[PDB]
Amino acid sequence: PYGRGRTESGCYQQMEEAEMLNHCGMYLMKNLGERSQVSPRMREEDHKQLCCMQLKNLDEKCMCPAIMMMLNEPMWIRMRDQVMSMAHNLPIECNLMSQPCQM
């Protein structure tokens, strides 16, 4: 499902500047803390192309090691515990972190 590859600050720093896994996070963070209570039909955006977008703006080497740091930003701590697995196949189905970093 993942790999092992540590390194100093890099892609992460380029991530905040190009918050790639920030919008795809809201979709996963929309049930992590949102008044499910809904009078009308429903309501909920979908940014799966805005993440798969900037994710490309990043390097193919930032599509695995960076993600880790993505869930370390000032918006991914405990609520990310869910966006962790959710954003584990989202970036893979895009070929971002499919299986780049291995053992």
From Swiss-Prot:
Family: Belongs to the 2S seed storage albumins family.
Subunit description: Heterodimer; disulfide-linked.
Record's keyword terms, sorted: Disulfide bond, Seed storage protein, Signal, Storage protein
The species this protein was found in: Helianthus annuus
Disulfide bonds, paired cysteine numbers: 11-62, 24-51, 52-94, 64-101
Job description of the protein: This is a 2S seed storage protein.
GO molecular function: nutrient reservoir activity
Superkingdom of origin: Eukaryota
Protein name: Albumin-8
